[PDB]
Structure formats: structure tokens, C-alpha cells
Amino acid sequence: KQTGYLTIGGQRYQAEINDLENLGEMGSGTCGQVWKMRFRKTGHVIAVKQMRRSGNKEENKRILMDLDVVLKSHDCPYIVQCFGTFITNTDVFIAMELMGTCAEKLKKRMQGPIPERILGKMTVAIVKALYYLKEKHGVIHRDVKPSNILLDERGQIKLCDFGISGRAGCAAYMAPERIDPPDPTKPDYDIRADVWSLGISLVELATGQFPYKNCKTDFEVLTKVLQEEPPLLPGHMGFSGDFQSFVKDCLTKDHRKRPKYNKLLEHSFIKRYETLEVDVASWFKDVMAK
Numbered sequence: 402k403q404t405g406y407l408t409i410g411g412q413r414y415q416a417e418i419n420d421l422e423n424l425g426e427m428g429s430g431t432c433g434q435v436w437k438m439r440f441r442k443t444g445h446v447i448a449v450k451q452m453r454r455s456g457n458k459e460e461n462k463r464i465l466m467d468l469d470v471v472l473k474s475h476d477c478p479y480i481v482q483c484f485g486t487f488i489t490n491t492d493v494f495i496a497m498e499l500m501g502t503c504a505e506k507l508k509k510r511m512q513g514p515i516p517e518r519i520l521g522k523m524t525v526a527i528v529k530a531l532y533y534l535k536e537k538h539g540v541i542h543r544d545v546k547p548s549n550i551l552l553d554e555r556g557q558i559k560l561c562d563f564g565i566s567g568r569a570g571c572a573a574y575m576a577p578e579r580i581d582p583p584d585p586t587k588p589d590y591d592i593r594a595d596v597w598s599l600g601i602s603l604v605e606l607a608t609g610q611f612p613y614k615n616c617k618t619d620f621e622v623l624t625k626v627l628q629e630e631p632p633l634l635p636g637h638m639g640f641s642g643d644f645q646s647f648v649k650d651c652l653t654k655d656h657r658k659r660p661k662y663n664k665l666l667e668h669s670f671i672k673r674y675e676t677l678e679v680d681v682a683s684w685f686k687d688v689m690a691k
């Protein structure tokens with residue numbers, strides 16, 4: 402790998418950091434400070450993550466760990482693409498494709514449920530992203546959630562933040578088998594805990610509310626996951642039978658029964674939103690403009 406260049410859309414300039422104008426930070430980063438930045442030759446805007454050599458040794462490790470994955474996933478359309486990097490005596494700058502926002506912040510702006518047609522095209526993207534990292538690189542995300550699903554003005558939906566990926570994330574979306582690992586721990590007991598997390602997220606974004614109510618502590622959530630029934634989609638909101646049975650499949654608590662990505666990608670709910678046209682781009686711009 403190299404650090405001189407910026408490969409965008411087939412081209413590849415050879416600039417340094419000062420060739421970019423800093424237009425501000427895009428929220429307090431949890432895996433590195435992220436700036437929205439603009440070229441001085443052309444005016445094109447990108448996202449640029451900064452790792453200070455002086456930074457916390459633990460954040461920096463995750464920044465480099467997320468960088469390790471996104472350098473290897475250029476050919477996956479459903480993962481935030483990295484354009485290149487710069488290494489100065491004091492910083493590392495990671496150039497990323499500029500995205501609109503996360504689905505967690507999208508939910509707060511909507512002030513309500515997100516339509517099924519959008520969650521549809523989201524499901525196809527995340528599952529295929531989680532599947533690519535598994536099949537091609539044997540990596541698991543280990544922290545899927547609405548704040549890790551980025552959308553943009555063009556209607557793209559990509560997964561991000563592989564900071565704790567590997568060959569413990571947020572507790573609310575953690576899978577049953579990660580909360581209490583099996584009696585003898587097989588190395589790949591973890592291989593499908595991400596499916597359960599995306600199911601929790603789909604229920605959250607579809608209903609506008611997190612399915613485990615009134616937990617004042619992290620552990621209290623963990624106990625509901627294991628004691629209460631899986632929180633399937635309600636019946637009184639016009640959700641289709643395909644959407645409800647896909648959410649039921651992912652939310653099967655017994656991990657030896659949760660279907661592999663192999664057959665989740667066969668699901669009708671997926672096959673519909675592969676060939677179905679949905680103007681997520683226009684729907685995105687509208688909620689933002691609101």
C-alpha cells in the first residue's frame with residue numbers, strides 16, 4: 402500500500418494535506434475526528450479522518466483497524482470507500498467518500514418511523530456488506546447499529562466503522578450468543594451475531610423506538626435480550642409479510658438456528674428490493690431539507 406495518492410473515480414492525483422480546504426468537522430467522531438474538506442484545485446468535497454500521533458493509543462488502534470478493512474474492500478459497493486491516506490510526522494489523514502449521515506441521526510430528524518421501502522434497500526446493502534467481509538476476508542463487524550449505516554444525497558447506503566472488527570460493541574444490539582457464549586466455545590460461534598444486530602436495528606428504524614423499553618443500565622438491556630421474547634415487528638403498521646418474516650429470521654435467538662447469509666440473501670424480502678426501484682436519493686434530500 403502507498404500514501405501519496407488520491408484515487409477517486411478512476412483518477413489518481415498525488416497531493417498532500419495542504420491541497421485541501423477544511424470546511425469543518427462532521428460531528429464528534431467515535432472512531433476518529435472527521436472533517437468535511439474541499440479541494441483547492443477543483444472544489445470537490447470529501448470526508449477526511451485525522452489520527453493524531455499524540456492521540457489516545459486505544460482510539461488510534463481502532464482507527465488503524467477500521468482503516469485495515471476499508472483498504473481491502475474497494476470492490477464492495479456497500480462499504481464506505483476510502484480514497485487514500487497521508488502520513489505526516491505528526492498525523493495520519495484518511496480520505497473517505499463523503500456521505501450524508503447515519504440512520505440514527507436520520508431517525509431523529511424524521512421524528513418517526515422510516516418507510517419500509519427505505520429499510521428494504523437498506524437491508525439488501527448491509528447484509529451484502531456483512532456477507533462480503535465474511536466470504537472474502539473472514540471478518541465480522543461486531544458492532545452493527547443505525548449509527549453505522551451511512552446514507553447520502555445520491556441514495557447510497559453503506560456500512561462503516563470497523564474499529565472493533567476482527568478475524569465488545571454496543572450492548573443494546575448485541576446478539577444472545579455474544580452475551581452468554583456457549584459451554585464449549587467454538588471459534589466461529591460468533592459468525593452470525595451481526596445478523597441479530599441488524600434485526601434489532603430494522604425494528605428500531607421501522608417502529609421509531611428501541612424495542613427494549615425503559616432500561617436504565619447496559620446490563621438491564623442484556624437481561625431483556627435473554628429473558629424476553631425476540632421483539633418482532635408489530636402487525637398494525639402495514640409492514641409486508643416478507644419484511645416481518647425476514648425480521649423474524651434474523652431475530653432467532655438460538656444461533657445454531659439463525660440462517661447463514663447464504664440463505665438470507667435468498668429471502669424474498671431481499672429478492673424484491675434487488676430488482677425494485679426505490680428513490681432513496683429523493684427521500685433522503687427531503688428529510689434532510691426538513
Ligand SMILES: */C=C/C(=O)N1CCC[C@@H](n2nc(C#C)c3c(N)ncnc32)C1
Pocket residue numbers: 427428429430431435448481497498499500501502503504505506548551561562
Ligand atoms: C450518524 C453519523 C455519525 O454520527 N458520524 C460520526 C462522526 C463521523 C461521521 N462520518 N464518518 C464517516 C466515515 C468514514 C463519514 C463519511 N464517510 N461521510 C460522512 N460522515 C461520516 C459519522
